[PDB]
């Protein structure tokens, strides 16, 4: 344990956040908010004391879970190149054990329901077993969790709302399938937990549609990034 270390505070909050995201994303009783266009794609929600209403997208992506995991872990600044909803992404600092601070500017929903917002995110990216324990190899799932924090030097901009992520994560599980042609290929069950403090006072019903829409529009960009990696023989 480090003395006079604000880095222990950052690493502590990232671990607490990662454990909370894994624990929330694996909770059993969910309410369907919206079904997606691709079969099996769903946005669900549920109440969690301390967090309020949380949202969860679940869908299958045709690529190894490890490949997507590697892009989220090591190439987060390249996120705007293939996901238009991310206008800016920069790493603030990397502080060990898969933990980093990043600045992200997100775009609005288009309908004007969710306006563009910026974020200062504390993140932990790790390999997990079935009981939520951090492993060095043979993982059951791959997590990349985030929570909003304050970083001196990244204050709220007067020109933009500083959003607040209470609990969130990308969670990927490897899945090897038999295709209709008989081939054995690697696939990934992809889940995205979202819980944001907007700041506004718009009814819960209209924001349920807004958040589900954001989630469904995101998976389209992930599948396009995946389809290009497939075509250019990277997967």
mmCIF file with all atom_site columns, C-alpha atoms in Angstrom:
data_model
loop_
_atom_site.group_PDB
_atom_site.id
_atom_site.type_symbol
_atom_site.label_atom_id
_atom_site.label_alt_id
_atom_site.label_comp_id
_atom_site.label_asym_id
_atom_site.label_entity_id
_atom_site.label_seq_id
_atom_site.pdbx_PDB_ins_code
_atom_site.Cartn_x
_atom_site.Cartn_y
_atom_site.Cartn_z
_atom_site.occupancy
_atom_site.B_iso_or_equiv
_atom_site.pdbx_formal_charge
_atom_site.auth_seq_id
_atom_site.auth_comp_id
_atom_site.auth_asym_id
_atom_site.auth_atom_id
_atom_site.pdbx_PDB_model_num
ATOM 1   C CA . UNK A 1 1   ? 0.000   0.000   0.000   1.00 0.00 ? 1   UNK A CA 1
ATOM 2   C CA . UNK A 1 2   ? 1.271   3.404   -1.145  1.00 0.00 ? 2   UNK A CA 1
ATOM 3   C CA . UNK A 1 3   ? 1.540   6.390   1.179   1.00 0.00 ? 3   UNK A CA 1
ATOM 4   C CA . UNK A 1 4   ? 0.540   9.924   -0.038  1.00 0.00 ? 4   UNK A CA 1
ATOM 5   C CA . UNK A 1 5   ? -0.971  8.305   -3.195  1.00 0.00 ? 5   UNK A CA 1
ATOM 6   C CA . UNK A 1 6   ? -4.021  9.698   -5.017  1.00 0.00 ? 6   UNK A CA 1
ATOM 7   C CA . UNK A 1 7   ? -3.228  6.823   -7.456  1.00 0.00 ? 7   UNK A CA 1
ATOM 8   C CA . UNK A 1 8   ? -4.455  4.341   -4.788  1.00 0.00 ? 8   UNK A CA 1
ATOM 9   C CA . UNK A 1 9   ? -7.731  6.378   -4.742  1.00 0.00 ? 9   UNK A CA 1
ATOM 10  C CA . UNK A 1 10  ? -7.989  6.121   -8.556  1.00 0.00 ? 10  UNK A CA 1
ATOM 11  C CA . UNK A 1 11  ? -7.139  2.393   -8.583  1.00 0.00 ? 11  UNK A CA 1
ATOM 12  C CA . UNK A 1 12  ? -9.547  1.768   -5.683  1.00 0.00 ? 12  UNK A CA 1
ATOM 13  C CA . UNK A 1 13  ? -12.448 3.493   -7.441  1.00 0.00 ? 13  UNK A CA 1
ATOM 14  C CA . UNK A 1 14  ? -11.708 1.622   -10.690 1.00 0.00 ? 14  UNK A CA 1
ATOM 15  C CA . UNK A 1 15  ? -11.770 -1.738  -8.864  1.00 0.00 ? 15  UNK A CA 1
ATOM 16  C CA . UNK A 1 16  ? -14.953 -0.765  -6.966  1.00 0.00 ? 16  UNK A CA 1
ATOM 17  C CA . UNK A 1 17  ? -16.527 0.354   -10.288 1.00 0.00 ? 17  UNK A CA 1
ATOM 18  C CA . UNK A 1 18  ? -15.429 -2.801  -12.174 1.00 0.00 ? 18  UNK A CA 1
ATOM 19  C CA . UNK A 1 19  ? -16.812 -5.018  -9.387  1.00 0.00 ? 19  UNK A CA 1
ATOM 20  C CA . UNK A 1 20  ? -20.107 -2.991  -9.366  1.00 0.00 ? 20  UNK A CA 1
ATOM 21  C CA . UNK A 1 21  ? -20.427 -3.238  -13.210 1.00 0.00 ? 21  UNK A CA 1
ATOM 22  C CA . UNK A 1 22  ? -19.827 -7.016  -13.252 1.00 0.00 ? 22  UNK A CA 1
ATOM 23  C CA . UNK A 1 23  ? -22.264 -7.483  -10.337 1.00 0.00 ? 23  UNK A CA 1
ATOM 24  C CA . UNK A 1 24  ? -24.994 -5.314  -12.016 1.00 0.00 ? 24  UNK A CA 1
ATOM 25  C CA . UNK A 1 25  ? -24.576 -6.785  -15.538 1.00 0.00 ? 25  UNK A CA 1
ATOM 26  C CA . UNK A 1 26  ? -25.008 -10.344 -14.136 1.00 0.00 ? 26  UNK A CA 1
ATOM 27  C CA . UNK A 1 27  ? -28.171 -9.476  -12.044 1.00 0.00 ? 27  UNK A CA 1
ATOM 28  C CA . UNK A 1 28  ? -31.135 -11.693 -13.052 1.00 0.00 ? 28  UNK A CA 1
ATOM 29  C CA . UNK A 1 29  ? -34.448 -9.742  -13.452 1.00 0.00 ? 29  UNK A CA 1
ATOM 30  C CA . UNK A 1 30  ? -34.500 -7.378  -16.432 1.00 0.00 ? 30  UNK A CA 1
ATOM 31  C CA . UNK A 1 31  ? -37.298 -5.460  -18.218 1.00 0.00 ? 31  UNK A CA 1
ATOM 32  C CA . UNK A 1 32  ? -37.247 -5.274  -22.027 1.00 0.00 ? 32  UNK A CA 1
ATOM 33  C CA . UNK A 1 33  ? -37.148 -1.640  -23.183 1.00 0.00 ? 33  UNK A CA 1
ATOM 34  C CA . UNK A 1 34  ? -36.521 -2.241  -26.887 1.00 0.00 ? 34  UNK A CA 1
ATOM 35  C CA . UNK A 1 35  ? -35.728 -5.160  -29.177 1.00 0.00 ? 35  UNK A CA 1
ATOM 36  C CA . UNK A 1 36  ? -33.220 -4.648  -31.986 1.00 0.00 ? 36  UNK A CA 1
ATOM 37  C CA . UNK A 1 37  ? -33.378 -5.259  -35.724 1.00 0.00 ? 37  UNK A CA 1
ATOM 38  C CA . UNK A 1 38  ? -30.948 -8.242  -35.584 1.00 0.00 ? 38  UNK A CA 1
ATOM 39  C CA . UNK A 1 39  ? -32.505 -11.301 -33.923 1.00 0.00 ? 39  UNK A CA 1
ATOM 40  C CA . UNK A 1 40  ? -31.442 -11.624 -30.258 1.00 0.00 ? 40  UNK A CA 1
ATOM 41  C CA . UNK A 1 41  ? -30.370 -7.936  -29.932 1.00 0.00 ? 41  UNK A CA 1
ATOM 42  C CA . UNK A 1 42  ? -32.068 -6.359  -26.896 1.00 0.00 ? 42  UNK A CA 1
ATOM 43  C CA . UNK A 1 43  ? -31.975 -3.264  -24.676 1.00 0.00 ? 43  UNK A CA 1
ATOM 44  C CA . UNK A 1 44  ? -33.209 -4.102  -21.181 1.00 0.00 ? 44  UNK A CA 1
ATOM 45  C CA . UNK A 1 45  ? -33.355 -2.115  -17.940 1.00 0.00 ? 45  UNK A CA 1
ATOM 46  C CA . UNK A 1 46  ? -33.659 -2.580  -14.199 1.00 0.00 ? 46  UNK A CA 1
ATOM 47  C CA . UNK A 1 47  ? -33.463 -0.741  -10.895 1.00 0.00 ? 47  UNK A CA 1
ATOM 48  C CA . UNK A 1 48  ? -30.335 -1.068  -8.747  1.00 0.00 ? 48  UNK A CA 1
ATOM 49  C CA . UNK A 1 49  ? -30.304 0.761   -5.319  1.00 0.00 ? 49  UNK A CA 1
ATOM 50  C CA . UNK A 1 50  ? -27.493 3.329   -5.358  1.00 0.00 ? 50  UNK A CA 1
ATOM 51  C CA . UNK A 1 51  ? -27.556 3.581   -9.186  1.00 0.00 ? 51  UNK A CA 1
ATOM 52  C CA . UNK A 1 52  ? -31.215 4.153   -10.094 1.00 0.00 ? 52  UNK A CA 1
ATOM 53  C CA . UNK A 1 53  ? -32.130 2.876   -13.552 1.00 0.00 ? 53  UNK A CA 1
ATOM 54  C CA . UNK A 1 54  ? -29.523 0.955   -15.489 1.00 0.00 ? 54  UNK A CA 1
ATOM 55  C CA . UNK A 1 55  ? -29.620 -0.077  -19.142 1.00 0.00 ? 55  UNK A CA 1
ATOM 56  C CA . UNK A 1 56  ? -28.152 -3.161  -20.782 1.00 0.00 ? 56  UNK A CA 1
ATOM 57  C CA . UNK A 1 57  ? -27.669 -4.012  -24.436 1.00 0.00 ? 57  UNK A CA 1
ATOM 58  C CA . UNK A 1 58  ? -27.094 -7.676  -25.304 1.00 0.00 ? 58  UNK A CA 1
ATOM 59  C CA . UNK A 1 59  ? -26.150 -8.909  -28.772 1.00 0.00 ? 59  UNK A CA 1
ATOM 60  C CA . UNK A 1 60  ? -23.944 -11.287 -30.765 1.00 0.00 ? 60  UNK A CA 1
ATOM 61  C CA . UNK A 1 61  ? -20.921 -9.929  -32.746 1.00 0.00 ? 61  UNK A CA 1
ATOM 62  C CA . UNK A 1 62  ? -19.277 -12.156 -35.414 1.00 0.00 ? 62  UNK A CA 1
ATOM 63  C CA . UNK A 1 63  ? -15.687 -12.011 -34.168 1.00 0.00 ? 63  UNK A CA 1
ATOM 64  C CA . UNK A 1 64  ? -13.512 -13.355 -31.307 1.00 0.00 ? 64  UNK A CA 1
ATOM 65  C CA . UNK A 1 65  ? -14.215 -11.703 -27.961 1.00 0.00 ? 65  UNK A CA 1
ATOM 66  C CA . UNK A 1 66  ? -10.393 -11.236 -27.573 1.00 0.00 ? 66  UNK A CA 1
ATOM 67  C CA . UNK A 1 67  ? -10.199 -9.186  -30.798 1.00 0.00 ? 67  UNK A CA 1
ATOM 68  C CA . UNK A 1 68  ? -12.845 -6.701  -29.648 1.00 0.00 ? 68  UNK A CA 1
ATOM 69  C CA . UNK A 1 69  ? -11.348 -6.685  -26.142 1.00 0.00 ? 69  UNK A CA 1
ATOM 70  C CA . UNK A 1 70  ? -7.929  -5.701  -27.617 1.00 0.00 ? 70  UNK A CA 1
ATOM 71  C CA . UNK A 1 71  ? -9.401  -2.766  -29.543 1.00 0.00 ? 71  UNK A CA 1
ATOM 72  C CA . UNK A 1 72  ? -11.263 -1.408  -26.482 1.00 0.00 ? 72  UNK A CA 1
ATOM 73  C CA . UNK A 1 73  ? -8.222  -1.874  -24.228 1.00 0.00 ? 73  UNK A CA 1
ATOM 74  C CA . UNK A 1 74  ? -5.444  -0.562  -26.451 1.00 0.00 ? 74  UNK A CA 1
ATOM 75  C CA . UNK A 1 75  ? -7.048  1.495   -29.191 1.00 0.00 ? 75  UNK A CA 1
ATOM 76  C CA . UNK A 1 76  ? -9.633  3.641   -27.414 1.00 0.00 ? 76  UNK A CA 1
ATOM 77  C CA . UNK A 1 77  ? -8.287  6.896   -29.056 1.00 0.00 ? 77  UNK A CA 1
ATOM 78  C CA . UNK A 1 78  ? -9.136  5.321   -32.509 1.00 0.00 ? 78  UNK A CA 1
ATOM 79  C CA . UNK A 1 79  ? -12.863 5.004   -31.444 1.00 0.00 ? 79  UNK A CA 1
ATOM 80  C CA . UNK A 1 80  ? -13.940 8.172   -33.410 1.00 0.00 ? 80  UNK A CA 1
ATOM 81  C CA . UNK A 1 81  ? -12.627 6.677   -36.734 1.00 0.00 ? 81  UNK A CA 1
ATOM 82  C CA . UNK A 1 82  ? -15.337 3.971   -36.784 1.00 0.00 ? 82  UNK A CA 1
ATOM 83  C CA . UNK A 1 83  ? -17.925 5.173   -34.226 1.00 0.00 ? 83  UNK A CA 1
ATOM 84  C CA . UNK A 1 84  ? -19.262 8.585   -35.287 1.00 0.00 ? 84  UNK A CA 1
ATOM 85  C CA . UNK A 1 85  ? -20.994 9.029   -31.912 1.00 0.00 ? 85  UNK A CA 1
ATOM 86  C CA . UNK A 1 86  ? -17.489 9.585   -30.365 1.00 0.00 ? 86  UNK A CA 1
ATOM 87  C CA . UNK A 1 87  ? -16.216 12.933  -31.494 1.00 0.00 ? 87  UNK A CA 1
ATOM 88  C CA . UNK A 1 88  ? -13.105 12.902  -29.297 1.00 0.00 ? 88  UNK A CA 1
ATOM 89  C CA . UNK A 1 89  ? -11.196 10.349  -27.278 1.00 0.00 ? 89  UNK A CA 1
ATOM 90  C CA . UNK A 1 90  ? -7.860  10.952  -25.580 1.00 0.00 ? 90  UNK A CA 1
ATOM 91  C CA . UNK A 1 91  ? -6.008  9.111   -22.799 1.00 0.00 ? 91  UNK A CA 1
ATOM 92  C CA . UNK A 1 92  ? -5.271  11.310  -19.780 1.00 0.00 ? 92  UNK A CA 1
ATOM 93  C CA . UNK A 1 93  ? -3.124  8.800   -17.852 1.00 0.00 ? 93  UNK A CA 1
ATOM 94  C CA . UNK A 1 94  ? -2.410  5.048   -17.427 1.00 0.00 ? 94  UNK A CA 1
ATOM 95  C CA . UNK A 1 95  ? -1.864  4.023   -13.803 1.00 0.00 ? 95  UNK A CA 1
ATOM 96  C CA . UNK A 1 96  ? -1.316  0.286   -13.838 1.00 0.00 ? 96  UNK A CA 1
ATOM 97  C CA . UNK A 1 97  ? -3.234  -2.997  -13.627 1.00 0.00 ? 97  UNK A CA 1
ATOM 98  C CA . UNK A 1 98  ? -5.318  -2.148  -16.754 1.00 0.00 ? 98  UNK A CA 1
ATOM 99  C CA . UNK A 1 99  ? -6.400  1.196   -15.254 1.00 0.00 ? 99  UNK A CA 1
ATOM 100 C CA . UNK A 1 100 ? -6.523  4.503   -17.123 1.00 0.00 ? 100 UNK A CA 1
ATOM 101 C CA . UNK A 1 101 ? -8.159  8.001   -17.188 1.00 0.00 ? 101 UNK A CA 1
ATOM 102 C CA . UNK A 1 102 ? -9.624  9.249   -20.499 1.00 0.00 ? 102 UNK A CA 1
ATOM 103 C CA . UNK A 1 103 ? -11.512 12.253  -21.916 1.00 0.00 ? 103 UNK A CA 1
ATOM 104 C CA . UNK A 1 104 ? -14.391 11.466  -24.283 1.00 0.00 ? 104 UNK A CA 1
ATOM 105 C CA . UNK A 1 105 ? -16.751 13.730  -26.167 1.00 0.00 ? 105 UNK A CA 1
ATOM 106 C CA . UNK A 1 106 ? -19.959 12.061  -27.295 1.00 0.00 ? 106 UNK A CA 1
ATOM 107 C CA . UNK A 1 107 ? -22.410 13.216  -29.947 1.00 0.00 ? 107 UNK A CA 1
ATOM 108 C CA . UNK A 1 108 ? -26.151 13.835  -29.391 1.00 0.00 ? 108 UNK A CA 1
ATOM 109 C CA . UNK A 1 109 ? -28.956 11.411  -30.281 1.00 0.00 ? 109 UNK A CA 1
ATOM 110 C CA . UNK A 1 110 ? -29.936 13.339  -33.409 1.00 0.00 ? 110 UNK A CA 1
ATOM 111 C CA . UNK A 1 111 ? -33.500 13.776  -32.142 1.00 0.00 ? 111 UNK A CA 1
ATOM 112 C CA . UNK A 1 112 ? -32.182 16.449  -29.698 1.00 0.00 ? 112 UNK A CA 1
ATOM 113 C CA . UNK A 1 113 ? -33.181 14.336  -26.652 1.00 0.00 ? 113 UNK A CA 1
ATOM 114 C CA . UNK A 1 114 ? -29.654 13.578  -25.527 1.00 0.00 ? 114 UNK A CA 1
ATOM 115 C CA . UNK A 1 115 ? -27.479 16.623  -26.330 1.00 0.00 ? 115 UNK A CA 1
ATOM 116 C CA . UNK A 1 116 ? -23.676 16.115  -26.940 1.00 0.00 ? 116 UNK A CA 1
ATOM 117 C CA . UNK A 1 117 ? -21.707 15.673  -23.714 1.00 0.00 ? 117 UNK A CA 1
ATOM 118 C CA . UNK A 1 118 ? -18.145 15.257  -22.546 1.00 0.00 ? 118 UNK A CA 1
ATOM 119 C CA . UNK A 1 119 ? -16.835 12.809  -19.936 1.00 0.00 ? 119 UNK A CA 1
ATOM 120 C CA . UNK A 1 120 ? -13.771 12.206  -17.749 1.00 0.00 ? 120 UNK A CA 1
ATOM 121 C CA . UNK A 1 121 ? -13.707 8.460   -17.333 1.00 0.00 ? 121 UNK A CA 1
ATOM 122 C CA . UNK A 1 122 ? -11.800 6.171   -14.901 1.00 0.00 ? 122 UNK A CA 1
ATOM 123 C CA . UNK A 1 123 ? -11.514 2.739   -16.430 1.00 0.00 ? 123 UNK A CA 1
ATOM 124 C CA . UNK A 1 124 ? -10.452 -0.795  -15.640 1.00 0.00 ? 124 UNK A CA 1
ATOM 125 C CA . UNK A 1 125 ? -10.040 -3.416  -18.380 1.00 0.00 ? 125 UNK A CA 1
ATOM 126 C CA . UNK A 1 126 ? -9.573  -7.031  -17.147 1.00 0.00 ? 126 UNK A CA 1
ATOM 127 C CA . UNK A 1 127 ? -10.014 -10.787 -17.757 1.00 0.00 ? 127 UNK A CA 1
ATOM 128 C CA . UNK A 1 128 ? -12.698 -12.323 -15.486 1.00 0.00 ? 128 UNK A CA 1
ATOM 129 C CA . UNK A 1 129 ? -13.741 -15.767 -14.375 1.00 0.00 ? 129 UNK A CA 1
ATOM 130 C CA . UNK A 1 130 ? -17.416 -16.879 -13.971 1.00 0.00 ? 130 UNK A CA 1
ATOM 131 C CA . UNK A 1 131 ? -17.315 -15.593 -10.294 1.00 0.00 ? 131 UNK A CA 1
ATOM 132 C CA . UNK A 1 132 ? -16.036 -12.094 -11.208 1.00 0.00 ? 132 UNK A CA 1
ATOM 133 C CA . UNK A 1 133 ? -12.421 -12.757 -10.157 1.00 0.00 ? 133 UNK A CA 1
ATOM 134 C CA . UNK A 1 134 ? -9.518  -11.224 -12.100 1.00 0.00 ? 134 UNK A CA 1
ATOM 135 C CA . UNK A 1 135 ? -7.572  -13.917 -14.022 1.00 0.00 ? 135 UNK A CA 1
ATOM 136 C CA . UNK A 1 136 ? -4.286  -13.858 -16.017 1.00 0.00 ? 136 UNK A CA 1
ATOM 137 C CA . UNK A 1 137 ? -5.535  -16.402 -18.656 1.00 0.00 ? 137 UNK A CA 1
ATOM 138 C CA . UNK A 1 138 ? -8.477  -18.626 -19.813 1.00 0.00 ? 138 UNK A CA 1
ATOM 139 C CA . UNK A 1 139 ? -11.152 -15.980 -19.089 1.00 0.00 ? 139 UNK A CA 1
ATOM 140 C CA . UNK A 1 140 ? -14.868 -16.632 -18.969 1.00 0.00 ? 140 UNK A CA 1
ATOM 141 C CA . UNK A 1 141 ? -15.410 -12.945 -19.946 1.00 0.00 ? 141 UNK A CA 1
ATOM 142 C CA . UNK A 1 142 ? -13.500 -9.736  -20.792 1.00 0.00 ? 142 UNK A CA 1
ATOM 143 C CA . UNK A 1 143 ? -14.611 -6.453  -19.084 1.00 0.00 ? 143 UNK A CA 1
ATOM 144 C CA . UNK A 1 144 ? -13.869 -2.814  -19.742 1.00 0.00 ? 144 UNK A CA 1
ATOM 145 C CA . UNK A 1 145 ? -15.639 -0.790  -17.026 1.00 0.00 ? 145 UNK A CA 1
ATOM 146 C CA . UNK A 1 146 ? -15.923 2.980   -16.591 1.00 0.00 ? 146 UNK A CA 1
ATOM 147 C CA . UNK A 1 147 ? -17.033 5.557   -14.043 1.00 0.00 ? 147 UNK A CA 1
ATOM 148 C CA . UNK A 1 148 ? -16.983 9.380   -14.140 1.00 0.00 ? 148 UNK A CA 1
ATOM 149 C CA . UNK A 1 149 ? -14.344 11.053  -11.977 1.00 0.00 ? 149 UNK A CA 1
ATOM 150 C CA . UNK A 1 150 ? -12.864 14.581  -11.578 1.00 0.00 ? 150 UNK A CA 1
ATOM 151 C CA . UNK A 1 151 ? -9.356  15.194  -12.937 1.00 0.00 ? 151 UNK A CA 1
ATOM 152 C CA . UNK A 1 152 ? -7.639  18.563  -12.240 1.00 0.00 ? 152 UNK A CA 1
ATOM 153 C CA . UNK A 1 153 ? -7.152  20.084  -15.677 1.00 0.00 ? 153 UNK A CA 1
ATOM 154 C CA . UNK A 1 154 ? -10.317 18.629  -17.268 1.00 0.00 ? 154 UNK A CA 1
ATOM 155 C CA . UNK A 1 155 ? -13.022 20.873  -15.787 1.00 0.00 ? 155 UNK A CA 1
ATOM 156 C CA . UNK A 1 156 ? -16.575 21.218  -17.172 1.00 0.00 ? 156 UNK A CA 1
ATOM 157 C CA . UNK A 1 157 ? -16.609 23.270  -20.360 1.00 0.00 ? 157 UNK A CA 1
ATOM 158 C CA . UNK A 1 158 ? -19.073 26.181  -20.442 1.00 0.00 ? 158 UNK A CA 1
ATOM 159 C CA . UNK A 1 159 ? -19.798 25.183  -24.087 1.00 0.00 ? 159 UNK A CA 1
ATOM 160 C CA . UNK A 1 160 ? -20.743 21.575  -23.204 1.00 0.00 ? 160 UNK A CA 1
ATOM 161 C CA . UNK A 1 161 ? -22.554 19.488  -20.595 1.00 0.00 ? 161 UNK A CA 1
ATOM 162 C CA . UNK A 1 162 ? -20.271 17.365  -18.494 1.00 0.00 ? 162 UNK A CA 1
ATOM 163 C CA . UNK A 1 163 ? -22.085 14.024  -18.387 1.00 0.00 ? 163 UNK A CA 1
ATOM 164 C CA . UNK A 1 164 ? -21.778 11.630  -15.439 1.00 0.00 ? 164 UNK A CA 1
ATOM 165 C CA . UNK A 1 165 ? -21.377 7.888   -15.883 1.00 0.00 ? 165 UNK A CA 1
ATOM 166 C CA . UNK A 1 166 ? -22.395 6.258   -12.524 1.00 0.00 ? 166 UNK A CA 1
ATOM 167 C CA . UNK A 1 167 ? -21.724 2.661   -13.621 1.00 0.00 ? 167 UNK A CA 1
ATOM 168 C CA . UNK A 1 168 ? -20.865 1.252   -17.026 1.00 0.00 ? 168 UNK A CA 1
ATOM 169 C CA . UNK A 1 169 ? -18.989 -1.468  -18.930 1.00 0.00 ? 169 UNK A CA 1
ATOM 170 C CA . UNK A 1 170 ? -18.413 -3.402  -22.126 1.00 0.00 ? 170 UNK A CA 1
ATOM 171 C CA . UNK A 1 171 ? -18.492 -7.133  -21.293 1.00 0.00 ? 171 UNK A CA 1
ATOM 172 C CA . UNK A 1 172 ? -17.546 -9.782  -23.859 1.00 0.00 ? 172 UNK A CA 1
ATOM 173 C CA . UNK A 1 173 ? -17.926 -13.570 -23.655 1.00 0.00 ? 173 UNK A CA 1
ATOM 174 C CA . UNK A 1 174 ? -16.267 -15.873 -26.186 1.00 0.00 ? 174 UNK A CA 1
ATOM 175 C CA . UNK A 1 175 ? -18.642 -18.105 -28.140 1.00 0.00 ? 175 UNK A CA 1
ATOM 176 C CA . UNK A 1 176 ? -17.614 -20.687 -30.773 1.00 0.00 ? 176 UNK A CA 1
ATOM 177 C CA . UNK A 1 177 ? -20.473 -21.427 -33.159 1.00 0.00 ? 177 UNK A CA 1
ATOM 178 C CA . UNK A 1 178 ? -21.300 -23.771 -36.014 1.00 0.00 ? 178 UNK A CA 1
ATOM 179 C CA . UNK A 1 179 ? -22.293 -21.592 -38.992 1.00 0.00 ? 179 UNK A CA 1
ATOM 180 C CA . UNK A 1 180 ? -25.113 -22.588 -41.422 1.00 0.00 ? 180 UNK A CA 1
ATOM 181 C CA . UNK A 1 181 ? -22.373 -23.809 -43.798 1.00 0.00 ? 181 UNK A CA 1
ATOM 182 C CA . UNK A 1 182 ? -20.915 -26.111 -41.108 1.00 0.00 ? 182 UNK A CA 1
ATOM 183 C CA . UNK A 1 183 ? -17.812 -24.047 -40.317 1.00 0.00 ? 183 UNK A CA 1
ATOM 184 C CA . UNK A 1 184 ? -16.649 -23.584 -36.713 1.00 0.00 ? 184 UNK A CA 1
ATOM 185 C CA . UNK A 1 185 ? -16.026 -19.849 -36.132 1.00 0.00 ? 185 UNK A CA 1
ATOM 186 C CA . UNK A 1 186 ? -15.399 -17.650 -33.087 1.00 0.00 ? 186 UNK A CA 1
ATOM 187 C CA . UNK A 1 187 ? -18.122 -15.256 -32.060 1.00 0.00 ? 187 UNK A CA 1
ATOM 188 C CA . UNK A 1 188 ? -18.762 -12.972 -29.042 1.00 0.00 ? 188 UNK A CA 1
ATOM 189 C CA . UNK A 1 189 ? -21.736 -12.327 -26.832 1.00 0.00 ? 189 UNK A CA 1
ATOM 190 C CA . UNK A 1 190 ? -21.447 -8.533  -26.364 1.00 0.00 ? 190 UNK A CA 1
ATOM 191 C CA . UNK A 1 191 ? -23.054 -6.689  -23.455 1.00 0.00 ? 191 UNK A CA 1
ATOM 192 C CA . UNK A 1 192 ? -23.030 -3.034  -22.666 1.00 0.00 ? 192 UNK A CA 1
ATOM 193 C CA . UNK A 1 193 ? -24.145 -1.695  -19.263 1.00 0.00 ? 193 UNK A CA 1
ATOM 194 C CA . UNK A 1 194 ? -25.021 2.005   -19.123 1.00 0.00 ? 194 UNK A CA 1
ATOM 195 C CA . UNK A 1 195 ? -26.100 4.244   -16.196 1.00 0.00 ? 195 UNK A CA 1
ATOM 196 C CA . UNK A 1 196 ? -25.784 7.989   -16.803 1.00 0.00 ? 196 UNK A CA 1
ATOM 197 C CA . UNK A 1 197 ? -26.703 11.021  -14.780 1.00 0.00 ? 197 UNK A CA 1
ATOM 198 C CA . UNK A 1 198 ? -27.889 13.270  -17.613 1.00 0.00 ? 198 UNK A CA 1
ATOM 199 C CA . UNK A 1 199 ? -28.371 16.553  -15.592 1.00 0.00 ? 199 UNK A CA 1
ATOM 200 C CA . UNK A 1 200 ? -31.697 17.423  -17.306 1.00 0.00 ? 200 UNK A CA 1
ATOM 201 C CA . UNK A 1 201 ? -35.263 16.868  -16.140 1.00 0.00 ? 201 UNK A CA 1
ATOM 202 C CA . UNK A 1 202 ? -36.813 15.018  -19.095 1.00 0.00 ? 202 UNK A CA 1
ATOM 203 C CA . UNK A 1 203 ? -39.386 12.227  -18.298 1.00 0.00 ? 203 UNK A CA 1
ATOM 204 C CA . UNK A 1 204 ? -38.030 8.719   -17.634 1.00 0.00 ? 204 UNK A CA 1
ATOM 205 C CA . UNK A 1 205 ? -40.240 7.283   -20.413 1.00 0.00 ? 205 UNK A CA 1
ATOM 206 C CA . UNK A 1 206 ? -38.775 9.489   -23.164 1.00 0.00 ? 206 UNK A CA 1
ATOM 207 C CA . UNK A 1 207 ? -35.193 8.966   -21.909 1.00 0.00 ? 207 UNK A CA 1
ATOM 208 C CA . UNK A 1 208 ? -35.754 5.140   -21.917 1.00 0.00 ? 208 UNK A CA 1
ATOM 209 C CA . UNK A 1 209 ? -36.279 5.368   -25.717 1.00 0.00 ? 209 UNK A CA 1
ATOM 210 C CA . UNK A 1 210 ? -33.373 7.796   -26.151 1.00 0.00 ? 210 UNK A CA 1
ATOM 211 C CA . UNK A 1 211 ? -30.847 5.533   -24.312 1.00 0.00 ? 211 UNK A CA 1
ATOM 212 C CA . UNK A 1 212 ? -32.072 2.359   -26.085 1.00 0.00 ? 212 UNK A CA 1
ATOM 213 C CA . UNK A 1 213 ? -31.696 4.176   -29.436 1.00 0.00 ? 213 UNK A CA 1
ATOM 214 C CA . UNK A 1 214 ? -28.066 5.175   -28.569 1.00 0.00 ? 214 UNK A CA 1
ATOM 215 C CA . UNK A 1 215 ? -27.274 1.554   -27.715 1.00 0.00 ? 215 UNK A CA 1
ATOM 216 C CA . UNK A 1 216 ? -28.809 0.174   -30.896 1.00 0.00 ? 216 UNK A CA 1
ATOM 217 C CA . UNK A 1 217 ? -27.016 2.779   -33.057 1.00 0.00 ? 217 UNK A CA 1
ATOM 218 C CA . UNK A 1 218 ? -23.704 1.821   -31.373 1.00 0.00 ? 218 UNK A CA 1
ATOM 219 C CA . UNK A 1 219 ? -23.881 -1.912  -32.206 1.00 0.00 ? 219 UNK A CA 1
ATOM 220 C CA . UNK A 1 220 ? -24.245 -0.968  -35.900 1.00 0.00 ? 220 UNK A CA 1
ATOM 221 C CA . UNK A 1 221 ? -20.825 0.759   -35.837 1.00 0.00 ? 221 UNK A CA 1
ATOM 222 C CA . UNK A 1 222 ? -19.279 -2.192  -33.971 1.00 0.00 ? 222 UNK A CA 1
ATOM 223 C CA . UNK A 1 223 ? -20.609 -4.655  -36.557 1.00 0.00 ? 223 UNK A CA 1
ATOM 224 C CA . UNK A 1 224 ? -19.319 -2.396  -39.397 1.00 0.00 ? 224 UNK A CA 1
ATOM 225 C CA . UNK A 1 225 ? -15.848 -2.261  -37.768 1.00 0.00 ? 225 UNK A CA 1
ATOM 226 C CA . UNK A 1 226 ? -16.032 -6.071  -37.418 1.00 0.00 ? 226 UNK A CA 1
ATOM 227 C CA . UNK A 1 227 ? -17.193 -6.604  -41.047 1.00 0.00 ? 227 UNK A CA 1
ATOM 228 C CA . UNK A 1 228 ? -14.218 -4.515  -42.298 1.00 0.00 ? 228 UNK A CA 1
ATOM 229 C CA . UNK A 1 229 ? -11.735 -6.458  -40.092 1.00 0.00 ? 229 UNK A CA 1
ATOM 230 C CA . UNK A 1 230 ? -13.213 -9.673  -41.603 1.00 0.00 ? 230 UNK A CA 1
ATOM 231 C CA . UNK A 1 231 ? -12.870 -8.421  -45.204 1.00 0.00 ? 231 UNK A CA 1
ATOM 232 C CA . UNK A 1 232 ? -9.300  -7.192  -44.749 1.00 0.00 ? 232 UNK A CA 1
ATOM 233 C CA . UNK A 1 233 ? -8.417  -10.693 -43.315 1.00 0.00 ? 233 UNK A CA 1
ATOM 234 C CA . UNK A 1 234 ? -7.542  -9.375  -39.802 1.00 0.00 ? 234 UNK A CA 1
ATOM 235 C CA . UNK A 1 235 ? -10.121 -11.955 -38.438 1.00 0.00 ? 235 UNK A CA 1
#
